[PDB]
Design a binder for this molecule. Sequence first.
Ligand SMILES: [Mg+2]
Ligand SMILES: [Mg+2]
Ligand SMILES: [Mg+2]
Ligand SMILES: [Mg+2]
Ligand SMILES: [Mg+2]
Ligand SMILES: [Mg+2]
Ligand SMILES: [Mg+2]
Ligand SMILES: [Mg+2]
Ligand SMILES: [Mg+2]
Ligand SMILES: [Mg+2]
Ligand SMILES: [Mg+2]
Ligand SMILES: [Mg+2]
Ligand SMILES: [Mg+2]
Ligand SMILES: [Mg+2]
Ligand SMILES: [Mg+2]
Ligand SMILES: [Mg+2]
Ligand SMILES: [Mg+2]
Ligand SMILES: [Mg+2]
Ligand SMILES: [Mg+2]
Ligand SMILES: [Mg+2]
Ligand SMILES: [Mg+2]
Ligand SMILES: [Mg+2]
Ligand SMILES: [Mg+2]
Ligand SMILES: [Mg+2]
Ligand SMILES: [Mg+2]
Ligand SMILES: [Mg+2]
Ligand SMILES: [Mg+2]
Ligand SMILES: [Mg+2]
Ligand SMILES: [Mg+2]
Ligand SMILES: [Mg+2]
Ligand SMILES: [Mg+2]
Ligand SMILES: [Mg+2]
Ligand SMILES: [Mg+2]
Ligand SMILES: [Mg+2]
Ligand SMILES: [Mg+2]
Ligand SMILES: [Mg+2]
Ligand SMILES: [Mg+2]
Ligand SMILES: [Mg+2]
Ligand SMILES: [Mg+2]
Ligand SMILES: [Mg+2]
Ligand SMILES: [Mg+2]
Ligand SMILES: [Mg+2]
Ligand SMILES: [Mg+2]
Ligand SMILES: [Mg+2]
Ligand SMILES: [Mg+2]
Ligand SMILES: [Mg+2]
Ligand SMILES: [Mg+2]
Ligand SMILES: [Mg+2]
Ligand SMILES: [Mg+2]
Ligand SMILES: [Mg+2]
Ligand SMILES: [Mg+2]
Ligand SMILES: [Mg+2]
Ligand SMILES: [Mg+2]
Ligand SMILES: [Mg+2]
Ligand SMILES: [Mg+2]
Lengths: 113, 119, 55, 206, 122
Amino acid sequence: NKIIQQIEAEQMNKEIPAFAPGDTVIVQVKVKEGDRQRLQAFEGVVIAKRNRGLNSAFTVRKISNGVGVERTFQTYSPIVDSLSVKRRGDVRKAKLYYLRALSGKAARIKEKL
Amino acid sequence: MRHRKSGRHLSRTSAHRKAMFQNMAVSLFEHELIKTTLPKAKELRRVAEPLITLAKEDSVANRRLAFDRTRSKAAVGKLFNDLGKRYANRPGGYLRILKCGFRAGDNAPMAYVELVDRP
Amino acid sequence: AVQQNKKSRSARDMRRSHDALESNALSVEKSTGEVHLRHHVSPDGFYRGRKVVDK
Amino acid sequence: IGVVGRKCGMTRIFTEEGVSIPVTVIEVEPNRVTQFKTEETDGYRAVQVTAGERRASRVTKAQAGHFAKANVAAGRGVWEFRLGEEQYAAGDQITVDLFQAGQMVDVTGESKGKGFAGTIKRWNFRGQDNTHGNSVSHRVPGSIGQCQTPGRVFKGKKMSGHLGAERVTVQSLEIVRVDAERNLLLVKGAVPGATGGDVIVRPAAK
Amino acid sequence: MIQTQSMLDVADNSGARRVMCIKVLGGSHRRYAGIGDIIKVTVKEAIPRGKVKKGQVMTAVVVRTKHGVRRTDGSIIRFDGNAAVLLNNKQEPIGTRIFGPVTRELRTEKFMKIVSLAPEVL
RNA sequence: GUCGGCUCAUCACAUCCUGGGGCUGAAGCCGGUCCCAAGGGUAUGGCUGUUCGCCAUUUAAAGUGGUACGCGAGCUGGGUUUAGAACGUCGUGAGACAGUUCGGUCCCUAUCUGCCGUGGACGUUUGAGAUUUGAGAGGGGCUGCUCCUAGUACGAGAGGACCGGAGUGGACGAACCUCUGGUGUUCCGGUUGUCACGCCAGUGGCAUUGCCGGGUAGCUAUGUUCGGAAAAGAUAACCGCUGAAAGCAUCUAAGCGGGAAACUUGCCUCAAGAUGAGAUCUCACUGGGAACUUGAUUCCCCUGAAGGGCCGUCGAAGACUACGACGUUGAUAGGCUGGGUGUGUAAGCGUUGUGAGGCGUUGAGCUAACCAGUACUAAUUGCCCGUGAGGCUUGACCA
RNA sequence: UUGUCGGGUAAGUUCCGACCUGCACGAAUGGCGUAACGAUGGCGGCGCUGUCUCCACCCGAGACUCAGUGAAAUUGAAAU
RNA sequence: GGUGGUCGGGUAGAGAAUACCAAGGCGCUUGAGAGAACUCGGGUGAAGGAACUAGGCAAAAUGGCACCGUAACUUCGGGA
RNA sequence: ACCCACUCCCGUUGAAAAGGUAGGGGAUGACUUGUGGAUCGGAGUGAAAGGCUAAUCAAGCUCGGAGAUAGCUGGUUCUCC
RNA sequence: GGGGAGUGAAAUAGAACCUGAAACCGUAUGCGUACAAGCAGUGGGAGCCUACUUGUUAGGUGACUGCGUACCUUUUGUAUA
Ligand SMILES: [Mg+2]
Ligand SMILES: [Mg+2]
Ligand SMILES: [Mg+2]
Ligand SMILES: [Mg+2]
Ligand SMILES: [Mg+2]
Ligand SMILES: [Mg+2]
Ligand SMILES: [Mg+2]
Ligand SMILES: [Mg+2]
Ligand SMILES: [Mg+2]
Ligand SMILES: [Mg+2]
Ligand SMILES: [Mg+2]
Ligand SMILES: [Mg+2]
Ligand SMILES: [Mg+2]
Ligand SMILES: [Mg+2]
Ligand SMILES: [Mg+2]
Ligand SMILES: [Mg+2]
Ligand SMILES: [Mg+2]
Ligand SMILES: [Mg+2]
Ligand SMILES: [Mg+2]
Ligand SMILES: [Mg+2]
Ligand SMILES: [Mg+2]
Ligand SMILES: [Mg+2]
Ligand SMILES: [Mg+2]
Ligand SMILES: [Mg+2]
Ligand SMILES: [Mg+2]
Ligand SMILES: [Mg+2]
Ligand SMILES: [Mg+2]
Ligand SMILES: [Mg+2]
Ligand SMILES: [Mg+2]
Ligand SMILES: [Mg+2]
Ligand SMILES: [Mg+2]
Ligand SMILES: [Mg+2]
Ligand SMILES: [Mg+2]
Ligand SMILES: [Mg+2]
Ligand SMILES: [Mg+2]
Ligand SMILES: [Mg+2]
Ligand SMILES: [Mg+2]
Ligand SMILES: [Mg+2]
Ligand SMILES: [Mg+2]
Ligand SMILES: [Mg+2]
Ligand SMILES: [Mg+2]
Ligand SMILES: [Mg+2]
Ligand SMILES: [Mg+2]
Ligand SMILES: [Mg+2]
Ligand SMILES: [Mg+2]
Ligand SMILES: [Mg+2]
Ligand SMILES: [Mg+2]
Ligand SMILES: [Mg+2]
Ligand SMILES: [Mg+2]
Ligand SMILES: [Mg+2]
Ligand SMILES: [Mg+2]
Ligand SMILES: [Mg+2]
Ligand SMILES: [Mg+2]
Ligand SMILES: [Mg+2]
Ligand SMILES: [Mg+2]
């Protein structure tokens, strides 16, 4: 797994800002709409983070048009063009799966400051 | 399967297994040489050797961590007053498993567990 | 489920052709000349020269 | 002609498009030709290779003489490859350069051993009722034959037994990357066996 | 990952509120329908003056699932529930509006009308 | 031991789909019928104990049979034949109905054959460590839709191809765990009741792991990858070429072809107990004495090789085995050190408050199975088996 | 006879409502209703779920191996 | 397995339920390993949610107190 | 608590000649229960199942008539002509 | 529990004691037996072993080979599954 680690470390050249679960992030997603490349922003709360080096992932939950959406992003995938934190959450947990049962004012994360 | 799994069931619940190996490690620290079955002696390494490693740094938090894992005041005192200082320069391997014969009652493979420096 | 025919004494003893006991690996201490199990502490209490249990 | 590598584990490759290719990394240490088998001597054409290392104490005198004839170091094993009109001399180094990225390969390995397996796992037998009165027969095979005719069980009946730990060949795997500087072979997908297991990579039969 | 007896919300304004899959189409012994697969549904709930009635057997296309859809990078998009859009015999939407987001897997020659009306495409 | 169901099947072909064809009241698309073909495939529900059937909705298709109407020492027990009770009916009655109805104990630790796995023994002619050929066997063999060809051929129009090519699916199967998840009573944390550790604090026991929230490795599908092929040969029906018997005709008599998912291969796995016990490379052993019932004999001493095993540390190998690795000339396991991962800011102290709590130290503390180093602990050059040049006959080289 | 019509379902030999052609209901072997009650029969729904698609992982107890003790039914003989 | 009566502490609790303990009494007269199939008894479970089945069998679920609120029908009590 | 025994599973050479685990019903009554007593073999007792009357019930057990009877089944032993 | 010693005519008459059968279980020796299909014998028959009578012998085993589906009962009829 020293051979594997070195292969993976080659493709982790992307610089990713530090974000924690509970953070509200904006993910710039590369979209190939036939011929026109563009960036579609996926804003939402990071409810889970999976740090496995190249195999890192994070899950962003948003309420879109009254329907909740959860996207699990592959952190080092080229599709994730950029990442930014709008605001930082103050949560006691690594995973925020309990947010799915909540909505509206009950699903508010305190800001970290 | 049990591919790449660690630990021995020893036909016990995990509560009883945890209680027994904490009893055995406490007994080993008191007497410095005990006789038990070879399977128990081999699994006692993974419980009693991290306790001696912890005892090398004497602090309130390490002593409390020792007491949570032993629940014995005498064992905690022996680990930090005698065994922690005795094995300060020893990089692990504080126990020695020596095979004796078999138990008379059930032909169970026996082992001697002794502390390395002096039993 | 049970036999329809009593098993013959030849057939009984043929199944037992795998029942023979094996001998243990026996070693001799050099400090004492004493016989012990290989890789085991000797009945007197010696292993590879030194006394370990001290009786 | 193929190579003998070790399965070094699974990872992924990200293309510029963003596609993630699951790859199995195979470390192919250079293979040493131990003996070239020709028709006029052995009835058939083949090349015998060795790979890796073996400590001198674990090499028998017969094997040591066999290796010294080829003037190669002892390996962890010895393998053969059936050949066409290829010519090899003992001591040659068949490295990972006989493959090129994009080409189909067949990877052969010993699959992971599961031990004694029931019919549900070994042969995908359906389970019986878990409730509704089923007594003690929830995972059991069921019937294994018919009746007085034919009054026996047919040979090859699917039964419980040992599963895995046998030679498996996965066919038509694409080579994703050939890393000759590190003796690495990246093939798309999964190959039989566990990490550290000997695998044989050959050009695809189909 | 919808099968027979699976209940789906209705993503268009055809008048149906709740539908139940009664057949996964397109294959013998086919088990599941994902986002973009067409199913046979029965209308379990409807609004009074809608285009479809309760107890009506129609074709629908799955547009949202809790099982989600996976992209080529290994990512997965999951939705809070399963939704469907009712189709007529020409495989065209019955309603004229689509509620909630859809995914880019619908961007085919068949369901491009659903994508155009969707408030969001993910 | 019965019907039906479940599980698991196996065979036939009088073929349901797929394949190949002849005739058609075959324009095309679709059909009808017959010949060949058994390789693979060949629904899910509602009702009913149902097999069936009807219905709904699919499918390329939802084949027909045999197998104790296959399968209860494999499961079920709805139906059907016990004992209870009831209705209709019959009988004066006890009762009865091949009418109905509510309820109603399904045993067996596998000896042999068989089958699925997995070993031990011996043999293969001196023994041994490796590699191997392949007689033979088994696995696999399904198929949709879309597009191009081409709105071309065909057709008044409507509609709408063959042949060929590309793509993308369903079902089935194998492997795998990078990914998406599940689990993860061996990791972390929260919390209720209670008991204890002298007490506070902090911890531990018990309560389904007390209840939960997460979660490493492993295992795993619902996740990932791959597969069925192409090709060849010999053929089936069928289509022929040449061609007489029979001046013609004629696929046939001589001769030469084409031709299918069937057969033989090709793909995968097993395979020299293939007693017909095969082949290759390499290694080891180069001493005497005596005797009888003289030679492929026996016995005594010396010798004990190559190698194998026992034993130990173990394993992604495993019921036990076996297999694979290592045994100090050592990273085989454990520990240790560092990292990783998970959890989520420990204890203590300080600070704010009346207090619960907050804040700082602090992404802290702890962290399984993972990765990398490291002889600290445990793997003792101990014993046993295995010998001492490998019979005879014939032939060819050779001396 | 799964009578027919209606309802309920995508689809209902069961169910509910009705018709009357009652094979062969019917008035204290009571007729027809009936609140409450029932470990009573039938049918439908919400919730809930490993009942199922389709099973996976985990925890104990057996099974397996070692040491001690030590049955059973059956059995004409077996080179089965 | 069955066997009449008496006593019956603490914390929580309505309680002689239940949990953890006290006074007391025990660890149930084969052990030791291993951690296959399968059986038994449990824990968790993606998506779906009765499609299972003769039948929701089994499981899952519900569950406490105070307060609000509560339908047809009724024998006026109920139903609740 | 106690009495009971509706469901499933287990168990079926059982721990047990009727049980156990998990659920279930009654639980101030036509209740459960101890001690003592009464009723019995064509007899008793029965909120009635032909239920129960010592693991025995469409007529208990035990001994006697009794070696009942058995047109039925099984078996019937040394040798030769 | 044995091995000697001793007692006794005898101890393998030693107290579970006269004799001490068979089933059944062993140890030793001889021969046969790991390419072979079935009521296990019988007919033929090599070799080996033992003993003297030294090969026209006796005993043991028996490679290989022809033939060959127990017995009782009951039956028209039974290897009868
Ligand atoms: Mg491990
Ligand atoms: Mg045990
Ligand atoms: Mg506990
Ligand atoms: Mg394994
Ligand atoms: Mg099933
Ligand atoms: Mg039952
Ligand atoms: Mg039972
Ligand atoms: Mg069961
Ligand atoms: Mg036969
Ligand atoms: Mg035919
Ligand atoms: Mg067929
Ligand atoms: Mg073929
Ligand atoms: Mg049906
Ligand atoms: Mg229904
Ligand atoms: Mg049958
Ligand atoms: Mg049977
Ligand atoms: Mg049974
Ligand atoms: Mg405290
Ligand atoms: Mg306690
Ligand atoms: Mg703080
Ligand atoms: Mg010699
Ligand atoms: Mg009707
Ligand atoms: Mg009616
Ligand atoms: Mg009447
Ligand atoms: Mg009257
Ligand atoms: Mg009445
Ligand atoms: Mg009642
Ligand atoms: Mg035993
Ligand atoms: Mg009582
Ligand atoms: Mg209590
Ligand atoms: Mg689930
Ligand atoms: Mg769920
Ligand atoms: Mg639901
Ligand atoms: Mg149903
Ligand atoms: Mg069904
Ligand atoms: Mg229930
Ligand atoms: Mg429950
Ligand atoms: Mg559960
Ligand atoms: Mg009640
Ligand atoms: Mg009666
Ligand atoms: Mg009685
Ligand atoms: Mg009488
Ligand atoms: Mg008389
Ligand atoms: Mg008589
Ligand atoms: Mg004398
Ligand atoms: Mg006498
Ligand atoms: Mg005597
Ligand atoms: Mg032979
Ligand atoms: Mg035989
Ligand atoms: Mg003769
Ligand atoms: Mg014969
Ligand atoms: Mg007869
Ligand atoms: Mg006859
Ligand atoms: Mg007979
Ligand atoms: Mg027979």
